[PDB]
Amino acid sequence: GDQICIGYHANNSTEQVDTIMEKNVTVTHAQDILEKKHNGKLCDLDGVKPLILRDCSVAGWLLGNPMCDEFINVPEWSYIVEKANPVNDLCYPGDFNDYEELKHLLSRINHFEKIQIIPKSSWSSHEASLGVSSACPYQGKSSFFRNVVWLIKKNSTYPTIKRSYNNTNQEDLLVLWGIHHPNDAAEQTKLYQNPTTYISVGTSTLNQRLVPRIATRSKVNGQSGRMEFFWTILKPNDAINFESNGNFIAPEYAYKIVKKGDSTIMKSELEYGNCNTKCQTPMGAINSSMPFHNIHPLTIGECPKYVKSNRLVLATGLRNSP
Amino acid sequence: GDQICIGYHANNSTEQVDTIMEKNVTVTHAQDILEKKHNGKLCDLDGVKPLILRDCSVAGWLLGNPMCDEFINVPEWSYIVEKANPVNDLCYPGDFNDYEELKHLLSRINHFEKIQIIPKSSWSSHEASLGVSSACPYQGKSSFFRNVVWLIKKNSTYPTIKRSYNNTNQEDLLVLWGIHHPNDAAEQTKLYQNPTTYISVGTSTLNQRLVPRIATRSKVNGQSGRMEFFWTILKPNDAINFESNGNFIAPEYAYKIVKKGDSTIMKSELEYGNCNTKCQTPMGAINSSMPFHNIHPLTIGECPKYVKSNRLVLATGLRNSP
Amino acid sequence: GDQICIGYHANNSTEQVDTIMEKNVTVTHAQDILEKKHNGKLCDLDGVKPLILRDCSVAGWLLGNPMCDEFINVPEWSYIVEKANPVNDLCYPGDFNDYEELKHLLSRINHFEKIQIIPKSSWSSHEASLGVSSACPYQGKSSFFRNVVWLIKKNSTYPTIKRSYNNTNQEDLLVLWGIHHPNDAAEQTKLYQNPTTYISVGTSTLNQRLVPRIATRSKVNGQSGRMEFFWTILKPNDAINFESNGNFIAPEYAYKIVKKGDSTIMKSELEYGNCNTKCQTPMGAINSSMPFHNIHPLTIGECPKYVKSNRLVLATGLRN
Amino acid sequence: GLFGAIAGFIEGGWQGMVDGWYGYHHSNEQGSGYAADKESTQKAIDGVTNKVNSIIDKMNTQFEAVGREFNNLERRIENLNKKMEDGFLDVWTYNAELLVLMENERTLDFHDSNVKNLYDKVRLQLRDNAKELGNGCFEFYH
Amino acid sequence: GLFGAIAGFIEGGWQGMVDGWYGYHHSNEQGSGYAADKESTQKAIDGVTNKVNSIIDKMNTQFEAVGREFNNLERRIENLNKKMEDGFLDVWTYNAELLVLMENERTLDFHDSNVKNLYDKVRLQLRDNAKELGNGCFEFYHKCDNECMESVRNGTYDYPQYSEEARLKREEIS
Amino acid sequence: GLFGAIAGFIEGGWQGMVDGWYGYHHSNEQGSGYAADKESTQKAIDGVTNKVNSIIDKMNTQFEAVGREFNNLERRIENLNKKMEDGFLDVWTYNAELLVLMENERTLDFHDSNVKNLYDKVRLQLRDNAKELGNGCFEFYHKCDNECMESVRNGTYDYPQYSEEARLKREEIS
Ligand SMILES: CC(C)N1CCC(NC(=O)c2c(Cl)cccc2Cl)CC1
Ligand SMILES: CC(C)N1CCC(NC(=O)c2c(Cl)cccc2Cl)CC1
Ligand SMILES: CC(C)N1CCC(NC(=O)c2c(Cl)cccc2Cl)CC1
Ligand SMILES: *[C@@H]1O[C@H](CO)[C@@H](O)[C@H](O)[C@H]1NC(C)=O
Ligand SMILES: *[C@@H]1O[C@H](CO)[C@@H](O)[C@H](O)[C@H]1NC(C)=O
Ligand SMILES: *[C@@H]1O[C@H](CO)[C@@H](O)[C@H](O)[C@H]1NC(C)=O
Ligand SMILES: *[C@@H]1O[C@H](CO)[C@@H](O)[C@H](O)[C@H]1NC(C)=O
Ligand SMILES: *[C@@H]1O[C@H](CO)[C@@H](O)[C@H](O)[C@H]1NC(C)=O
Ligand SMILES: *[C@@H]1O[C@H](CO)[C@@H](O)[C@H](O)[C@H]1NC(C)=O
Ligand SMILES: *[C@@H]1O[C@H](CO)[C@@H](O)[C@H](O)[C@H]1NC(C)=O
Ligand SMILES: *[C@@H]1O[C@H](CO)[C@@H](O)[C@H](O)[C@H]1NC(C)=O
């Protein structure tokens, strides 16, 4: 007799999927939805190069540690890359006040224009050229942070400093200054003459009076002294006023905030790859239309959604006959 | 011959639902579970009116900015409404210490009873009536915060203040005071005579010694001086002790905490709408038995659960025949 | 005619389960997956006893409140247990700076060894034995925190103290010191002679200068004065340097951090129960192969996962 | 659908049957007419009503957002706060939308299965006493 | 039930069948008795055991609460902490309760489907060699001794061997 | 599976059918050959494609981690930060893995159901004009040339045209 049979597709597919009740089910067709591959390097993001700090910390860059001269004037960036433990940080040891809040602001900034707010040459009652240390070497000579000026007594006198800067720009200005905490009363006298000193700083919102602290400390990079750095955002048309009779690390250069947008500080040891991507991770860039990836949670750009999975495959076709 | 047919309901229903495999499936019956409508007003909550600060900040209210006289004595409230950027804040410029922690406490409070703890008239060795500024106008005349007193020298002298207040009430007391940071040593002398001043403040827990900071600042509301305000919760039977030889902004009025409960500080630009509701959002009130809504995440009262969905419809009936 | 019938199991089972569309469905077999039982005791964790602070706070223990002598020398612990409101805390009233950050560090530590960094006997220009208070009683006599020394003027003089200690150990050191905030200028003179005083403390990272504050305060445990305590971690091969002309509550003993690992500070009113467990909660220990429990969210050890459910039963068999 | 009855071997629904979800059309000498199966319609109502109530009550324990405020030097915790609150709102939105999608599919298949089972109830009663037309109808041999 | 077999066309279960989930009751001349289908019972056990293990393992990476402490001027972050921890506890409680409700429904329907498929396995073996009573039972048109019954159970029934005898009992003879 | 058709009453798949998911094998006098059911294969493609797109789009609103940094005296909030971010990553991992497991099970059962329904479409057309072998195959009681076979495939089989011939062969054999 004549026959008609009902049946279904089978093939040479080895593609496996999982269900609640059964693992490793061979099927005829499947869709992998998990990206697992990356190019292992740092790329431009939609045409814009990242700022790669190499051996420099954000602090090293913004104060101008003399080992960080490659970053003296940086172009517009897409994102920032910092090593876990950069060796070029505070060459003269000390502290950076509210450093993590500063880095958080940096995450919304794509470009600074460095600007001279107080010329080093305008200090006529104080020595502006003796503020150097063997802690901050440049080409075998004692140096210092390039963006600030360590003021010293002139002719055994340190008159009271009264200096202003008015932000006549249409952008917010990041302004950096510091105080020197010496080793002893003798060092205080040697550097500044005046035994009891302060630094006052005012804006529309800031009302600061810093006092140096003498304490006996362990040598770090050969120094027992400490520098402590402070910052503020000076809004358009606001002024900053400084007053001091000693221990003042004065601004020379400040940073105008000329481009805001999406950015990040990415922790990565990786190399620049002279490549372009839409999606960067600290382990490498991703080029994929897959909706998920398992590379790293901390990504930037138009990325697949991160999951911890080793495997994600959707069944499209039928159970396959072995 | 005779026939019996098995079949199912169909109807005029146009109601659509979604499934994984198919969108826009017409069904015979459905339940919408998403409230999408509100009345666009700020309402009483189960019969209790909110405190609507209009153009006043919480600080403006609690220090008694003279533009905030509408709030000199506020009755029990259900919730508080503050604008994003209230214009009546610190009329004399400066800072409110731990302001966000104070607002957080306010979120658990439904009623204060204001009380005079140190009468303005009780200051016999100091001027209590010269503490006014053009920064704090009332009806075109120089004024000041109403709940604290700016003390001035009397007859070229400022004796040392020693004042205590013992909380003889059964409730916690919110106590507010301040310090004046002047523009210069000449202003210090003119206002307070004594050149080197302090404010000490002690309770069972508090151990405060405040020193003024003299510095040149940008003018805000015409002033280069700054007021800095402080607060504490004085427990029943504890005492607060003040000592000062100048720059003291003394309490006059303090707040008894008479009712604690669920409250919130809600950010809205809306005004009062002379309505009642069981559920209020910053965009408007909700009257619904629906289990979900998409109006706004920050609600107070007996509310449906918030979701970001545009549409939530449960299939109850059958796939519908055209 | 001969018959074969197809059928399925039924039984005497009363076990009930839930579905979206039907509650209280009787089934033939089920698996309960929720542990609901505990032994109501504090136990050793895989053979290691916890440190049970009884009536002492972490501060009471580490500063050596004289009521806390049970904890003068504690062995390696699995976890720490503190009461909600321990009565033996700061016997002399005041504050412990960054206390909650210190407790957080303690949660990653299983063993401290006490080490003498400044001998009590080395204070030859100061009185080291007058620093006692009726606020800190031991056996009906005025006493003080045992791990620090309240230094007083000797023969109406308080020379400037300069003391250093170099961490020659392979381990981090927790170091504790303090300042005394007196009631008035008269008390300042009586105790320390010098009217204007400081404490400076420096390491490779620390740069501290403390000044006493005079304020008029309510009596707590009979005192209007306050003690304020500070701490730091001194790394291997770094040194700590102290300088003071008064108000100094000087270290004698510090703590070597000899074992780091999984630990916790557990809030419980319970006492030791001479038991062993792989999983402890503040309400009692758990012995179970169940994948979930509803006892308490804050557990330590190899534990089931916590959920708020009263009931979790999986259907294995058929409708009955 | 999964069970092959609704818009399958039964081609369409009856506008005519108003008082029920599933049932019968009879046509004898007395004349035609529609009648609803009360027993299977009530069982379906019990199930769907329980499902709606189960979906609502499972969302009793959903996350409630709170206002917290931060100053200009607390930007890290301000951002942590905003991401934590948005995080939970996105989790509960996904939970609500997915539960509704998944239970909608089961509800339509539930109806498909109830109709197939009603047809089989009747077939196993009638046996060779009637002819299976294959359109949902049985022609009686009396 | 979705598949119409359990508490459907098979009216109820057998207290009598103890060593299996699904199976058979035979009644020939040699006498009656119950026997469990080993193959379909074992397949159902493998499936349910895998489901229980899959539900447990999916909850291995569930949120673990940690003790953090805050002072009296850290109320905002104390509250952030408490809401974050409660938030995840509520998420994982919903996940556990919903997964159990949904998989319980699938388990009961799985059993319903296994019974329906066992019945159809036998029907497609017996064809016209037996009569479908409509209660789960097949009346044979031939003699089926304890060794014929086992051929049905183990799924190797010889349809041709009995078809001629079956036709003579089923139909008019001429 | 649930519907009893795939790896059930139809023992295996056909390497031979290449241009379809489900369909037919005919064997008459003109000879054998495979042909795919276009209508049910396309309906299955539409369904699975919609499912994949629905699963992807439901994960558009998934949690995105941000780098925050904390100093050595902010260990409590550093730990709160790390637990909050890990917490959401574990929630969205569970959601993705479980949705895929549950929808994989529904997809395989969807195919099982489409095959069962194709078989029933044909059975209800052929009625007593053919014999049900119980392996997915129908032995015709009449001659069914390549143009009769296509009438079965396209779902317009003329039952009356062949019923008299079919009855004569049927009552003969059984
Ligand atoms: C014709 C009538 C008996 N029908 C069937 C049942 C009825 N109920 C529902 O659809 C329903 C609704 Cl609309 C909401 C909640 C629960 C249920 Cl069961 C809809 C109208
Ligand atoms: C007759 C008996 C051996 N059956 C077979 C399965 C048996 N076990 C279970 O129901 C079961 C249980 Cl109770 C837990 C996990 C996994 C399974 Cl399969 C109880 C019923
Ligand atoms: C051409 C035919 C034999 N099949 C059926 C259609 C095709 N579809 C899929 O497997 C599929 C895939 Cl591989 C991804 C997304 C959606 C779908 Cl439906 C696989 C090839
Ligand atoms: C599935 O197959 C691969 C083969 O390498 C293996 O890694 C995995 O563990 C298998 N799973 C099971 C349950 O057999
Ligand atoms: C240094 O300054 C003093 C006065 O302050 C003055 O007497 C002296 O001549 C100055 N010396 C030089 C070389 O400028
Ligand atoms: C569903 O229909 C509505 C019109 O009522 C329309 O808004 C929408 O685009 C349709 N969606 C799809 C996917 O067809
Ligand atoms: C800064 O200069 C601008 C003029 O460009 C002026 O408007 C403003 O008042 C100045 N600000 C201060 C604080 O001096
Ligand atoms: C406040 O007064 C009460 C009653 O007069 C007294 O018992 C208490 O000691 C006082 N509190 C303080 C802190 O002085
Ligand atoms: C049966 O059902 C109710 C809810 O319908 C529930 O409270 C309980 O778990 C069960 N047992 C009772 C009420 O004794
Ligand atoms: C106290 O001070 C001086 C030592 O220089 C001396 O007058 C006196 O003897 C000292 N000691 C005592 C115990 O009085
Ligand atoms: C501590 O002691 C060792 C050994 O004498 C020495 O190398 C080290 O530099 C000392 N540390 C400090 C901070 O002086």
Tab-separated table of N, CA and C in Angstrom, chain A residues 1-12 17-21 23 25 27-29 31 33 82 100 103 265 267 291-292 297-298 305-309 312-319 321, chain F residues 6-7 10 12-15 17-18 20-29 48 52 55 59-60 62 64-65 69 71 89-90 93 97 100-101 104-105 107 111 122 136-140 143-144 149:
chain	number	residue	atom	x	y	z
A	1	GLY	N	0.836	-1.257	0.000
A	1	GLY	CA	0.000	0.000	0.000
A	1	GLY	C	0.846	1.272	0.000
A	2	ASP	N	0.286	2.374	-0.516
A	2	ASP	CA	0.924	3.722	-0.553
A	2	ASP	C	0.972	4.288	0.877
A	3	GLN	N	2.038	5.030	1.211
A	3	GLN	CA	2.275	5.591	2.574
A	3	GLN	C	2.511	7.106	2.508
A	4	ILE	N	1.930	7.848	3.454
A	4	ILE	CA	2.396	9.213	3.846
A	4	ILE	C	2.807	9.162	5.323
A	5	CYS	N	4.011	9.658	5.628
A	5	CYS	CA	4.588	9.744	7.001
A	5	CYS	C	4.770	11.217	7.400
A	6	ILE	N	4.476	11.549	8.659
A	6	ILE	CA	4.836	12.853	9.288
A	6	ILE	C	6.161	12.673	10.034
A	7	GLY	N	7.070	13.633	9.861
A	7	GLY	CA	8.380	13.651	10.539
A	7	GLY	C	8.917	15.060	10.720
A	8	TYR	N	10.164	15.162	11.165
A	8	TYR	CA	10.790	16.451	11.554
A	8	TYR	C	12.274	16.426	11.185
A	9	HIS	N	12.874	17.621	11.106
A	9	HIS	CA	14.278	17.878	10.682
A	9	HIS	C	15.251	17.216	11.661
A	10	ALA	N	16.351	16.675	11.127
A	10	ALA	CA	17.579	16.294	11.864
A	10	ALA	C	18.789	16.698	11.023
A	11	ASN	N	19.983	16.775	11.630
A	11	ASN	CA	21.207	17.271	10.948
A	11	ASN	C	22.466	16.839	11.712
A	12	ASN	N	23.626	17.360	11.301
A	12	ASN	CA	24.964	17.021	11.872
A	12	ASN	C	25.335	18.014	12.983
A	17	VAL	N	22.326	22.729	24.449
A	17	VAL	CA	21.612	23.715	25.310
A	17	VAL	C	21.198	23.022	26.606
A	18	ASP	N	20.811	23.823	27.594
A	18	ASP	CA	20.391	23.374	28.942
A	18	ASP	C	18.934	23.783	29.128
A	19	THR	N	18.229	22.997	29.935
A	19	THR	CA	16.842	23.206	30.424
A	19	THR	C	16.838	22.884	31.923
A	20	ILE	N	15.767	23.221	32.652
A	20	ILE	CA	15.621	22.886	34.101
A	20	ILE	C	15.877	21.390	34.320
A	21	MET	N	15.228	20.530	33.522
A	21	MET	CA	15.160	19.063	33.785
A	21	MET	C	16.308	18.310	33.094
A	23	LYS	N	20.416	18.675	31.075
A	23	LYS	CA	21.632	19.399	30.620
A	23	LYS	C	22.112	18.769	29.310
A	25	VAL	N	21.632	18.988	25.959
A	25	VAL	CA	20.651	18.521	24.943
A	25	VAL	C	21.138	19.010	23.580
A	27	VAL	N	20.710	20.002	19.801
A	27	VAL	CA	19.572	20.585	19.026
A	27	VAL	C	20.056	20.839	17.595
A	28	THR	N	19.141	21.121	16.676
A	28	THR	CA	19.424	21.217	15.218
A	28	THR	C	19.940	22.621	14.905
A	29	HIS	N	19.428	23.610	15.635
A	29	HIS	CA	19.794	25.042	15.529
A	29	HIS	C	19.778	25.667	16.933
A	31	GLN	N	21.092	29.746	19.038
A	31	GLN	CA	21.708	31.094	19.005
A	31	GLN	C	22.516	31.299	20.287
A	33	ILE	N	24.243	33.800	22.679
A	33	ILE	CA	23.915	35.242	22.929
A	33	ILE	C	24.966	35.894	23.848
A	82	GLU	N	44.397	54.708	34.293
A	82	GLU	CA	45.354	54.838	35.416
A	82	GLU	C	45.752	53.414	35.804
A	100	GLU	N	39.314	61.545	46.114
A	100	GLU	CA	38.305	60.650	45.475
A	100	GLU	C	37.130	61.495	44.960
A	103	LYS	N	38.473	62.935	41.650
A	103	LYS	CA	38.472	61.901	40.582
A	103	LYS	C	37.033	61.694	40.089
A	265	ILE	N	37.306	56.945	34.858
A	265	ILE	CA	38.693	56.542	35.161
A	265	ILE	C	38.724	55.020	35.245
A	267	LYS	N	40.810	51.536	35.606
A	267	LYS	CA	42.012	50.865	36.173
A	267	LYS	C	42.440	49.729	35.236
A	291	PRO	N	23.926	40.360	22.588
A	291	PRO	CA	23.331	41.188	23.638
A	291	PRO	C	23.998	41.098	25.022
A	292	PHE	N	24.762	40.032	25.307
A	292	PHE	CA	25.482	39.834	26.591
A	292	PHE	C	26.978	39.618	26.359
A	297	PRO	N	32.724	43.751	34.303
A	297	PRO	CA	31.587	44.630	34.563
A	297	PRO	C	31.786	46.122	34.234
A	298	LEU	N	33.006	46.656	34.279
A	298	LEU	CA	33.229	48.125	34.220
A	298	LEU	C	33.588	48.513	32.788
A	305	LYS	N	25.239	43.812	27.661
A	305	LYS	CA	24.985	43.760	29.122
A	305	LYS	C	25.856	42.663	29.739
A	306	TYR	N	26.518	42.967	30.848
A	306	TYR	CA	27.458	42.052	31.530
A	306	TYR	C	26.698	40.989	32.328
A	307	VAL	N	27.163	39.741	32.277
A	307	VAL	CA	26.696	38.644	33.169
A	307	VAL	C	27.912	37.818	33.561
A	308	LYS	N	27.829	37.078	34.663
A	308	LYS	CA	28.954	36.244	35.166
A	308	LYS	C	28.999	34.875	34.465
A	309	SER	N	28.058	34.564	33.572
A	309	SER	CA	27.912	33.232	32.917
A	309	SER	C	29.122	32.868	32.047
A	312	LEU	N	25.767	30.953	27.465
A	312	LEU	CA	24.338	31.317	27.298
A	312	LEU	C	23.912	31.042	25.852
A	313	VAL	N	23.182	29.936	25.630
A	313	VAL	CA	22.719	29.490	24.282
A	313	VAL	C	21.204	29.253	24.321
A	314	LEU	N	20.476	29.977	23.465
A	314	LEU	CA	19.027	29.790	23.215
A	314	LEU	C	18.814	28.662	22.189
A	315	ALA	N	17.972	27.683	22.527
A	315	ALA	CA	17.376	26.729	21.571
A	315	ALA	C	16.504	27.510	20.581
A	316	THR	N	16.759	27.338	19.284
A	316	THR	CA	15.857	27.815	18.197
A	316	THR	C	15.184	26.615	17.507
A	317	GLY	N	15.955	25.576	17.164
A	317	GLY	CA	15.478	24.358	16.483
A	317	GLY	C	15.062	23.254	17.448
A	318	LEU	N	15.092	22.006	16.965
A	318	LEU	CA	14.449	20.823	17.590
A	318	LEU	C	15.511	20.004	18.305
A	319	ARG	N	15.087	19.139	19.222
A	319	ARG	CA	15.931	18.044	19.764
A	319	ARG	C	16.468	17.239	18.569
A	321	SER	N	18.398	13.975	16.721
A	321	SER	CA	18.595	12.498	16.767
A	321	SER	C	20.088	12.179	16.690
F	6	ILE	N	7.923	14.170	19.165
F	6	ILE	CA	9.399	14.151	18.905
F	6	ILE	C	10.054	13.159	19.873
F	7	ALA	N	10.933	12.298	19.354
F	7	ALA	CA	11.583	11.178	20.081
F	7	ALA	C	10.541	10.425	20.931
F	10	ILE	N	6.974	9.184	17.004
F	10	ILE	CA	7.915	9.325	15.851
F	10	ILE	C	9.341	9.166	16.387
F	12	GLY	N	12.485	9.051	15.404
F	12	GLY	CA	13.658	9.872	15.030
F	12	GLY	C	13.344	10.942	13.992
F	13	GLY	N	14.316	11.819	13.717
F	13	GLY	CA	14.252	12.855	12.666
F	13	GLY	C	14.813	12.364	11.334
F	14	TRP	N	14.576	13.121	10.263
F	14	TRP	CA	14.988	12.768	8.878
F	14	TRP	C	16.123	13.684	8.427
F	15	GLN	N	17.369	13.181	8.410
F	15	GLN	CA	18.528	13.840	7.728
F	15	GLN	C	18.087	14.275	6.322
F	17	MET	N	15.153	15.400	5.093
F	17	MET	CA	14.373	16.657	4.949
F	17	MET	C	15.258	17.835	5.373
F	18	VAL	N	15.652	18.662	4.404
F	18	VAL	CA	16.728	19.686	4.526
F	18	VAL	C	16.099	21.086	4.549
F	20	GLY	N	13.123	22.190	5.570
F	20	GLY	CA	12.012	22.370	6.525
F	20	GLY	C	12.329	21.813	7.901
F	21	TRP	N	11.540	22.235	8.892
F	21	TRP	CA	11.630	21.775	10.307
F	21	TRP	C	10.708	20.571	10.500
F	22	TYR	N	9.471	20.687	10.015
F	22	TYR	CA	8.464	19.601	9.998
F	22	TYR	C	8.005	19.326	8.552
F	23	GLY	N	7.611	18.079	8.252
F	23	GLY	CA	6.932	17.732	6.986
F	23	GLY	C	6.680	16.243	6.776
F	24	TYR	N	6.748	15.820	5.506
F	24	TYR	CA	6.179	14.545	4.995
F	24	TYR	C	7.206	13.739	4.186
F	25	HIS	N	7.098	12.408	4.265
F	25	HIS	CA	7.688	11.409	3.334
F	25	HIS	C	6.552	10.611	2.682
F	26	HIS	N	6.419	10.705	1.356
F	26	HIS	CA	5.435	9.943	0.540
F	26	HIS	C	6.165	8.784	-0.153
F	27	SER	N	5.495	7.639	-0.320
F	27	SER	CA	5.998	6.450	-1.061
F	27	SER	C	4.824	5.754	-1.771
F	28	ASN	N	4.603	6.094	-3.047
F	28	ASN	CA	3.568	5.500	-3.938
F	28	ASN	C	4.287	4.721	-5.055
F	29	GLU	N	3.603	4.448	-6.179
F	29	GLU	CA	4.145	3.701	-7.352
F	29	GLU	C	5.176	4.558	-8.097
F	48	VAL	N	9.677	31.663	17.175
F	48	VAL	CA	11.020	31.526	17.812
F	48	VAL	C	11.773	32.853	17.656
F	52	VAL	N	13.257	35.174	20.715
F	52	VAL	CA	14.676	35.617	20.838
F	52	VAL	C	14.704	37.150	21.015
F	55	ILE	N	13.363	38.275	24.467
F	55	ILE	CA	14.313	37.969	25.576
F	55	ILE	C	15.406	39.048	25.597
F	59	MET	N	16.023	42.660	28.446
F	59	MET	CA	17.324	42.865	29.147
F	59	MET	C	17.964	44.204	28.747
F	60	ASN	N	17.197	45.092	28.112
F	60	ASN	CA	17.633	46.469	27.752
F	60	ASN	C	17.889	47.299	29.021
F	62	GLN	N	18.996	46.450	32.061
F	62	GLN	CA	19.860	45.718	33.025
F	62	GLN	C	20.895	46.673	33.655
F	64	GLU	N	24.100	48.646	35.098
F	64	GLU	CA	25.452	49.035	34.597
F	64	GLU	C	26.311	49.509	35.780
F	65	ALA	N	27.415	48.797	36.032
F	65	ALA	CA	28.373	49.071	37.121
F	65	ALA	C	29.153	50.364	36.824
F	69	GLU	N	35.761	55.298	43.924
F	69	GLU	CA	36.972	55.067	44.735
F	69	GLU	C	36.774	55.638	46.137
F	71	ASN	N	38.898	56.130	50.151
F	71	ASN	CA	40.202	56.204	50.857
F	71	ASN	C	40.166	55.157	51.981
F	89	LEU	N	24.721	42.548	39.887
F	89	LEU	CA	25.333	41.664	38.860
F	89	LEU	C	24.822	40.229	39.069
F	90	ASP	N	24.720	39.749	40.315
F	90	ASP	CA	24.237	38.381	40.643
F	90	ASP	C	22.733	38.280	40.323
F	93	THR	N	22.459	38.189	36.419
F	93	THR	CA	23.003	36.883	35.968
F	93	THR	C	21.939	35.794	36.172
F	97	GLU	N	20.156	33.661	33.090
F	97	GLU	CA	20.368	32.200	33.069
F	97	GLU	C	18.996	31.520	33.184
F	100	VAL	N	16.624	31.907	30.072
F	100	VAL	CA	17.129	31.025	28.989
F	100	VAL	C	16.770	29.556	29.288
F	101	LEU	N	17.001	29.054	30.509
F	101	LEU	CA	16.659	27.663	30.883
F	101	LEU	C	15.166	27.432	30.639
F	104	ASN	N	14.092	27.703	26.883
F	104	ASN	CA	14.652	26.542	26.148
F	104	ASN	C	13.677	25.367	26.277
F	105	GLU	N	13.211	25.065	27.490
F	105	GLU	CA	12.233	23.983	27.761
F	105	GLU	C	10.953	24.247	26.969
F	107	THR	N	10.617	26.003	24.214
F	107	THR	CA	10.921	25.959	22.762
F	107	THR	C	10.879	24.496	22.277
F	111	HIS	N	8.041	22.758	19.568
F	111	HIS	CA	8.346	21.921	18.383
F	111	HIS	C	7.574	20.592	18.481
F	122	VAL	N	-3.499	15.685	9.433
F	122	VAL	CA	-3.480	14.628	8.380
F	122	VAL	C	-4.439	13.488	8.753
F	136	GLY	N	4.074	7.312	12.960
F	136	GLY	CA	3.973	8.579	12.213
F	136	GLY	C	3.481	8.378	10.790
F	137	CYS	N	3.369	7.125	10.328
F	137	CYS	CA	3.035	6.763	8.920
F	137	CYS	C	1.582	6.282	8.808
F	138	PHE	N	0.918	6.681	7.722
F	138	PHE	CA	-0.448	6.259	7.314
F	138	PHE	C	-0.367	5.415	6.031
F	139	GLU	N	-0.673	4.108	6.111
F	139	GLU	CA	-0.805	3.208	4.927
F	139	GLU	C	-2.188	3.445	4.307
F	140	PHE	N	-2.212	3.938	3.067
F	140	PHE	CA	-3.458	4.213	2.308
F	140	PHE	C	-4.150	2.890	1.950
F	143	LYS	N	-5.030	3.744	-3.944
F	143	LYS	CA	-3.872	4.295	-4.691
F	143	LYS	C	-3.909	5.811	-4.493
F	144	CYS	N	-2.757	6.403	-4.178
F	144	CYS	CA	-2.562	7.854	-3.911
F	144	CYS	C	-1.311	8.293	-4.686
F	149	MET	N	-1.231	12.856	-2.974
F	149	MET	CA	-0.266	13.205	-1.892
F	149	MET	C	-0.255	14.722	-1.652
